[PDB]
Scaffold this active site. Sequence first.
Site, short mmCIF file in Angstrom:
data_model
loop_
_atom_site.label_atom_id
_atom_site.label_comp_id
_atom_site.label_asym_id
_atom_site.label_seq_id
_atom_site.Cartn_x
_atom_site.Cartn_y
_atom_site.Cartn_z
N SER A 1 0.85 -1.18 0.00
CA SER A 1 0.00 0.00 0.00
C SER A 1 0.89 1.23 0.00
CB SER A 1 -0.95 0.02 1.20
OG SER A 1 -0.38 0.74 2.28
N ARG A 2 0.27 2.39 -0.21
CA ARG A 2 0.97 3.66 -0.23
C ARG A 2 0.85 4.42 1.09
NH1 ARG A 2 2.08 1.92 -5.63
NH2 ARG A 2 3.29 3.58 -6.65
#
Lengths: 171, 52, 337, 85, 261
Positions: free
Chosen positions: C202-203
């Site tokens: 994920s970011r």
Amino acid sequence: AKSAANKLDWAKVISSLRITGSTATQLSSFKKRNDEARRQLLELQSQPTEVDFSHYRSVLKNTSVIDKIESYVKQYKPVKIDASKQLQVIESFEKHAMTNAKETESLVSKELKDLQSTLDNIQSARPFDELTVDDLTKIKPEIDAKVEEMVKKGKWDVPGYKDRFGNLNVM
Amino acid sequence: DRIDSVSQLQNVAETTKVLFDVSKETVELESEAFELKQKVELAHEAKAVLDS
Amino acid sequence: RQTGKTAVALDTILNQKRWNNGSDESKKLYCVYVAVGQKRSTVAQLVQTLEQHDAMKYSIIVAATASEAAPLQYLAPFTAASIGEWFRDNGKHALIVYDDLSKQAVAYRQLSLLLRRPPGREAYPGDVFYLHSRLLERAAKLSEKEGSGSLTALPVIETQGGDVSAYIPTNVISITDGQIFLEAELFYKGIRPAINVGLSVSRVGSAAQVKALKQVAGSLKLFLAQYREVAAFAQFGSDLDASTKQTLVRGERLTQLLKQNQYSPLATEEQVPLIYAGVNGHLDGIELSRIGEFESSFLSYLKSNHNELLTEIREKGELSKELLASLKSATESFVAT
Amino acid sequence: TNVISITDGQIFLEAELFYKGIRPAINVGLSVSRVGSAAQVKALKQVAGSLKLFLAQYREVAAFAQFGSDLDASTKQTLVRGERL
Amino acid sequence: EVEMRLKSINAIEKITKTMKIVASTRLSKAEKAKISAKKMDEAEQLFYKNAETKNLDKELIVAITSDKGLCGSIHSQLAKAVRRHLNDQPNADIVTIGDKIKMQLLRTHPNNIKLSINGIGKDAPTFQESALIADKLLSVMKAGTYPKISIFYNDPVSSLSFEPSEKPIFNAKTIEQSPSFGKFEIDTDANVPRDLFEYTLANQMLTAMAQGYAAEISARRNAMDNASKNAGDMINRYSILYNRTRQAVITNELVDIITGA
Ligand SMILES: Nc1ncnc2c1ncn2[C@@H]1O[C@H](COP(=O)(O)OP(=O)(O)O)[C@@H](O)[C@H]1O
Ligand SMILES: [Mg+2]
């Protein structure tokens, strides 16, 4: 009130030194734990005894039953008298509890004083190199009885005589 | 060794008494929990017939 | 399929109830479901489960089942996006779950085949990537000037045989901000979440989190991936590995820790101590088989006789030096049990 | 797939036993006759019942070829009977 | 996967097959040597059970293994056996013969080990090297001081299963006196206690090392057979995958020809 009880119960559980080998106090512990869990479940899941007719009655048009259920709950809230009668066997158990608990406290206290005195007079005085046999005989007379019993039986080599001492068998 | 094995039942006796009485009273006061639970069940039944 | 994508979506929707049941609109998450390409019996069971947990009050079930035509399937997620922007443009926060966009893509295929648009690649019209782009990029967190609204999106794709290298996978993994892998083998193994730590990225690593969990496990995913690689390396050859490796032991204990049952939304407060025990090497002597019982015992410990630091974490939304010390106290007091 | 769906059972053949030496490379595990038992001469039908279990057990315990010497006596006997058949 | 298939078929399957084959060729010669030495070992053991020379009441550990690099599970089994023995008593001067057992002893009990010998598992055992090793061990370490000497060496039952069989070593103290030393006539002037002690230290250790070599190469054959089975099933599944992929190329060319043309 429950917080302090949980604190002391868990501290007692984790500090068990001569309180091991138990079979039923842990059962009462889980009994109290599940009782508290039921308490919490009841508080978090408290359904509304009275009917919320302020916002719910308007939903139903041809109810024909809301008055009946309202009356039924109105007559049901006094379900019965609460027991609250934990004062016939619990009280006797507790009375015996503090009585013989004070007895045990007194006996362990005097045992501790006796052990402290024993250590004090063991290490503070009574040298052994200059100790005389007559002092041992006057302190304890069962050695004399032992001498009688192994003289009459005629066994002068009872096991455990010079294993920890010096035999010094020169010849 | 006898000394430090014996020297435990001095400040723990009061803890044992308080834990015993607290646990017994909490176990035996479950009548209040039972009453609240049955009241909750009946209120839930009333609400259930309501949405029915 | 049947790996837990809809399961994790519904667990998130149920968990949002604890925050949308209050009054602070800045924390409420008005969910909206997109049951595109879903049989009407399944969506009926889903809405039944939602209102069973009192989750229907804040969830929109705008969808197109398999009964209606392909254009319904193609447009339902876009209209769900419109509802999501309405919630977002008004300063509110909405969670949208595009459940199984694959039927949306194949519905667009059905439109384009007889609408005289030639297919672009792999019998798919080229504009599938563009449509995914416009649909998922509408999901965004607005700035304070625009109202600070949020449009959190949870896209779901049904891949065949775990082929994340197929076309539609490649586009949607490149369209999103990270992914959550749910392989079938992990589901069949016994792990109900069945999430592979190694590829699920994920970011928002150690960001956009509570803060209590972000400090404990801000980089735990890389450690778990390295644990998996070394465990593969450990089985390759007999060396200073296996139980003799502290990293391997910690990784296996953490992987066994990361498990969950469906319809069981767990709050953020009862998640830090488990991960903290896992990350800080406090699970060396707890054994893999006993970690499942350790989780329940530790949670009961906090919720019964250590609610102080738990409620402090819940209300503060962060673990400070005092909270870290209290959690350390709890964890090495309960490590003996 | 269309052909196996229309046909009432198939008899799989593979070139790999054809190369190892079993030129009639008929494998029971993937071959099946849905009406073969009802349309088989009675003698073979009654005697072939024991063949199926024997060769199936041999093929499932065939993974460890050079291991049955000390694995199990039953596994060794199964391997012997399977290769004989 | 063409390079992967090639390295699977001709780099980990066929050469592993031929290395298992050379392992079996070594197994035949080592079995001949093992039975030859086991002749005098059986003689010595039957003599010792005929004349009980059990030692009553400073310990020795001898780690005997070949130079093979952990052929599957024999080295791990020997390492766990010596670990258990060290747990029983960690006050013995461990002597390690080999390389893998040497580093296992180094990583387990570096303090206890005080002697290591290399270049032993080059080939089938030779008597001269074993006897010289015994002389060195009895000289620098003085095995006579320790009443009990432990020698570790694996034993295959027929082909596969192995056990860490250990044979007791009788010192001159338990030879000059024993429960049944009077059965066999001895010469006091000939110093036969020490002579028999050194003779058993030589013969038992030599045949222990020969049997350890035989068990090591049998476990090597088993491990390379397991690796061959792994290569075979990997090759089968990856050849199915290769056929699937190469047929998928045909499907792709079919689809782009019927779409483009
Ligand atoms: N603890 C659990 N967590 C997740 N799923 C579970 C659990 N227990 C059982 N299941 C089953 O897993 C299934 C999840 O399937 P789902 O992910 O909805 O399919 P799809 O991926 O096609 O939407 C459910 O039907 C449910 O019966
Ligand atoms: Mg679904």
